[PDB]
């Protein structure tokens, strides 16, 4: 059952799959990118210690170290009431290992000796160096007395020299605690090797464990178990004088690398039509959590991908560093704590902007209160904010004057008006889109350049991709995703000098891609993709493509048919090369053929038919696509030519040219690339859904009762749909 998958102290709730819900706009909690939840899977990672070689003073200390410490742990158990007996059963207060190490099973004695060895070697592997303070310390033998009755059956007196004398410094204590962490991690390693996983209770029948859990989440009683073993081991080791010198402890900063994909921040702003061109306005921004947030005014041309203040689009204020942001970073103001309000002011007519923090007006490094001295009106200014990783913020546009709390103390007497001072309908607020989409390559785009090559009598029409900024500094090499705008429609019902008749009745289409010399082709992938493809990764491989296998079976269970579904149907040119470095003579020519009647995706490279082939479902829209990493100024080229007995891609794409054997590249066809610079419109009204636990017998209830609707505009060629 799924109820027992919940983390121990964590409580089960049924929550919205998406971040936002239906609530008041000023109480709305804007959310930044979330931290990557890598802690969900508890994978133990004990550090390997086989490479560790024990110092000679530690081999010829640890045998009697080990014997004394197991005599001490049997003392620690006789404290709880643990008695020796012939029978192995622990419940009957009898156990044959309470006797001296010679008499007790030598196998468990040796396991104790090598776990002591593991403790010492792991101290060495943690950098915890050990240096004997004085050899007279182990020359002298001080040993507390133990009565026979309080003692074990053996005459050995485990009590070493009085342990209250020695104290362990806090850093040494910390490293030793996380050494015990490593010990329980080794235990978890053993359990996983056994086949023994996390659960809620001891089920020898089900053969799961409950207690498998990270140390920070570990249970109290076993926590104290490893605490007592830790105390005993380190106290004895210090009692023998074998002083351990702590390794240097230097600070390390990770600064929230763990996040969903590469998104560092999310930008929230109003609609462009709400831009202010004259007057004076005021709004508020409430910082629920202190973080790397920015708030201020942006121009309508602000890019959702770039950070606020880097360019000329936006003017913003940063809290932690107390930095103003416009075309660079300069010092201004102070840092905010959780709950602070930092709402902004703008005077458009004299072209100035000011800021406050909990009412008091922030000042510059100099005495000037003016955050940004002077600026041109431009096309207007619109409220904006930036939320970092694991950041929560609220914006109040002053639709209701009473909700603006510091407005009365500062902003009202000066004459500032709320941004939504006179509006009957709520403000439409736009945020940065998370999922990338395919859009036309801009001409101004300095990194990607597209050339359309007209097809002559002897040459097919070609589209060639070039990088203008290749070989220059600041240029970041990352895999770009390219596709063609128009898709190929497969047949709805699968049927179960060239020859003019065959070429007229056929439904097979062909395009080819030439990888220009100098662009090594292991970085180039060629094939088809569908409209569902929206995956952006800095490192792409054919193994990680999303796929599913729907198996429809008959009544008794036989799989009478199985279907493979995937958005990506692509091949790699590096593996396509049969001769190593045999491609540098001339650019390699991947060729792709699609049979709309049968749904067969086969690839022909250098005149030979590659083994890889795909089968797609009927009525599937396939977009030609090439993914490549740039290693040369010239990356690749699209070719729209036709091989023998195959219809060029123009016939498949355009309906008016269905029966035209001559290849064509109409202006409608263009090369699009995956990009993240797009905004999304947050719906004004959301569905009303209430969830609650009825009872343990009845479970959690979900209810939605009132309808909402939106009219969607569907782009036919792109197989897309937007509100």
């Amino acid at each position: 059952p799924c109820y027992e998958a919940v983390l121990p102290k964590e409580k089960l709730k049924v929550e919205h799959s998406r971040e936002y819900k239906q609530e008041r706009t000023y109480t709305r909690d804007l959310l930044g990118p979330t931290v990557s939840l890598t802690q969900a899977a508890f994978t133990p990672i004990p550090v390997d210690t086989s490479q560790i070689v024990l110092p000679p003073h530690l081999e010829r200390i640890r045998e009697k170290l080990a014997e004394n410490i197991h005599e001490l742990w049997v003392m620690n158990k006789i404290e709880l009431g643990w008695q020796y007996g012939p029978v192995r059963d622990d419940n009957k207060r009898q156990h044959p290992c309470l006797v001296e190490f010679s008499k007790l099973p030598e196998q468990e004695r040796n396991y104790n000796l090598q776990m002591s060895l593991e403790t010492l070697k792991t101290l060495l592997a943690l950098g915890c160096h050990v240096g004997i303070s004085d050899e007279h310390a182990e020359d002298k033998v001080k040993k507390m007395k133990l009565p026979k009755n309080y003692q074990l059956t053996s005459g050995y007196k485990p009590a070493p020299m009085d342990l209250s004398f020695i104290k362990l410094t806090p850093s040494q204590e910390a490293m030793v605690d996380k050494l015990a962490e490593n010990a329980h991690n080794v235990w978890a390693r053993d359990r996983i090797r056994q086949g023994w996983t996390y659960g809620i209770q001891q089920d020898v029948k089900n053969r799961r464990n409950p207690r498998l859990v990270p140390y920070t989440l570990l249970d109290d009683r076993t926590k104290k178990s490893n605490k007592d073993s830790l105390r005993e081991a380190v106290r004895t080791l210090l009692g023998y004088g074998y002083n351990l010198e702590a390794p240097d402890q230097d600070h390390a900063a990770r600064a929230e690398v763990c996040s969903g994909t590469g998104e560092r921040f999310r930008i929230f702003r109003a609609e462009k039509t709400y831009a202010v061109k004259a007057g004076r306005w005021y709004f508020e921004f409430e910082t629920v959590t202190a973080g790397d947030m920015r708030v201020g005014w942006s121009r309508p041309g602000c890019q959702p991908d770039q950070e606020l203040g880097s360019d000329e689009r936006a003017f913003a204020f940063d809290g932690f560093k107390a930095q103003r942001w416009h075309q660079g970073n300069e010092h201004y103001g102070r840092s905010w704590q959780a709950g602070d309000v930092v709402g902004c002011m703008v005077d458009m007519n004299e072209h100035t902007m000011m800021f406050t923090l909990n009412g008091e007006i922030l000042l510059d490094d100099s005495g000037s209160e003016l955050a940004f001295k002077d600026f041109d009106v431009g096309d207007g200014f619109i409220p904006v904010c930036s939320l970092g990783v694991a950041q929560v913020g609220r914006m109040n546009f002053g639709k209701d004057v009473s909700t603006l709390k510091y407005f009365t103390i500062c902003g009202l007497q000066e004459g500032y008006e709320p941004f939504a001072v006179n509006t009957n309908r709520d403000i439409t607020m736009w945020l940065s889109k998370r999922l990338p989409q395919f859009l036309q390559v801009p001409s101004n785009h300095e990194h990607i350049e597209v050339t359309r090559i007209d097809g002559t009598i002897d040459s097919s029409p070609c589209l060639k991709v070039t990088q203008k900024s290749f070989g220059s500094q600041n240029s970041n090499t990352d895999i770009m995703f390219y596709r063609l705008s128009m898709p190929i429609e497969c047949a709805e019902v699968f049927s179960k000098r060239d020859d003019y008749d065959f070429l007229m009745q056929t439904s097979t289409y062909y395009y080819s891609v030439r990888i220009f010399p100098g662009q090594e082709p292991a970085n180039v992938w060629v094939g088809w993709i569908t409209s569902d493809f929206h995956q952006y990764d800095t490192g792409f491989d054919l193994d990680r493509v999303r796929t599913v296998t729907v198996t429809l079976g008959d009544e008794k269970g036989k799989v009478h048919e199985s279907i493979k579904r995937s958005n990506c149907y692509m091949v790699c040119a590096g593996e396509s090369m049969s001769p190593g470095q045999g491609r540098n003579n001339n650019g390699l020519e991947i060729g792709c053929v699609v049979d709309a009647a049968s749904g067969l995706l086969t690839f022909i490279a250098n005149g030979k038919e590659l083994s890889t082939y795909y089968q797609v479902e009927p009525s599937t829209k396939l977009f030609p696509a090439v993914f490549a990493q740039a290693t040369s100024p010239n990356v690749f080229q699209f070719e729209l030519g036709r091989i023998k007995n195959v219809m060029p891609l123009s016939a498949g794409l355009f309906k008016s040219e269905h029966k035209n054997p001559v290849p064509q590249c109409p202006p409608r066809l263009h090369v699009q690339f995956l990009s993240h610079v797009l905004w999304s419109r947050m719906p004004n009204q959301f569905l009303k859904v209430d969830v609650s636990r009825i009872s343990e017998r009845q479970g959690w209830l979900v209810q939605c009762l009132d309808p909402l609707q939106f009219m969607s505009l569907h782009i036919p060629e792109e197989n897309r749909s937007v509100d």
Binding site: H251, A253, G471, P517, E520, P579, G580, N585, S632, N634
Partner: protein, 538 residues
Amino acid sequence: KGCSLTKAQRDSIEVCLLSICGQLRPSMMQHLLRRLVFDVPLLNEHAKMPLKLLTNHYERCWKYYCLPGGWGNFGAASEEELHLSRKLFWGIFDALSQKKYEQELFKLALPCLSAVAGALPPDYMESNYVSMMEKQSSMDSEGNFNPQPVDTSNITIPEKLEYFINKYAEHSHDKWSMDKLANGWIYGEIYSDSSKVQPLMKPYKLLSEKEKEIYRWPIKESLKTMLAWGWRIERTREGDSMALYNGYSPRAIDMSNVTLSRDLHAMAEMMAENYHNIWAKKKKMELESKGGGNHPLLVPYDTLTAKEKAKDREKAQDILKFLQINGYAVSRGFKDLELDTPSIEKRFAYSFLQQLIRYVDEAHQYILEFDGGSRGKGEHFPYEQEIKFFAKVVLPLIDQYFKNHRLYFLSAASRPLCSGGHASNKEKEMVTSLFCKLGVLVRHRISLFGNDATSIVNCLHILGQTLDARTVMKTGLESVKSALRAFLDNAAEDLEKTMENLKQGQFTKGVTQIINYTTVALLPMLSSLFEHIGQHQF
């Protein structure tokens, strides 16, 4: 550096170079700094202008060297700049120490040395790794260029390299033939230069056996001078694939289009200076053979201009590119065995402050000898130059260094300056020992001080309100603790006897000198101590 210049010409050159270097990028001038580190320590009359230019550089770009990130636009240090700056600082410091006191030279040198000290990070680890073929011999003072050739005839090449130069011999013969084609030579039976007919239209399998050796031997020397620096070069399966696949018109695989890695671009350019220096060695030998007509291009490669340097970059680039085209691998000559970061002595500030320890203990021994000789009328001692150097540079340099690095010595990686700035506990306690020992040195010695006691008191009290006393009495070397306690107790009875003499006599000879020392130095000193104690709750 030319000598025949007039004074006005020299001044014009100084101001031009000053303005240019001041307004240039910080990264550009490290090339010139590499010659400055070698020319300044002479500290002749010529080194004055280098002193100004170093002062202006380090005052402009201190924040770059101090902050690990520096300016975001300017970048950060490369650590060879740090190494050369360390060598420059130590050379100026010690050379100025062993040379005699000239008032103008020392006043001009102080800002420079004290600015290098401020620019250099205190915690700076010494780079355990060293350089190859340091070319200070090449930039020799006489002749301006010594193109020393690195010896390479000791290493031999294996059969892998045999096949490699065989294939590159085919490849070079291929460019021979395409240059032939682009030039216009044609096939024939007779030999004529004007007719454009070469006697070599017969194929490679018959091609003459002398004609590779003019490719082999130069390229052989080239690969051996690679392998002399420490390359261990190996081969991949690409050459095996070549072997398995298995006068004439060739085709050239385009080859400049493939771009190369940063470190191997640096690799090609450094091998390029080695081979251009070998070339300039034979050219210079030809010049002494002729006895005249000095070749203008005999200038160092660091001073050559890029157009003429392309002449060996093209061969560097294409030879390395064909090196991994035929599927070998590149290796750095050496990899560091171990980094000695645990050493607190590895910090710049550590070695610097122990150098201060030795110099101040030297000053202590001197002031003892000057007190033993102060009972003589004439204090004509050889150590006046040493004490002038001390009180004019080192103590003012101590002032400069601490008023540049307040935060580092006050930060113990606690929480201020989250970027860092940790001064270790024992470093801190020995700094406090230096403070107390300087105090001991300067007590009741104002009259012997040639009006330098004012600057001494300034440095003294700024050190007084810049202390780490809490750290020192929680952790320290107890002998250092005893020394500081003894200094504070000596001052303690000084205050009592100055209460006494001033109460028996309301108005103010050794006792007169010491009471003047009291009334003009201890009151600022006591104010600084008490205010520091009361602001940091010591």
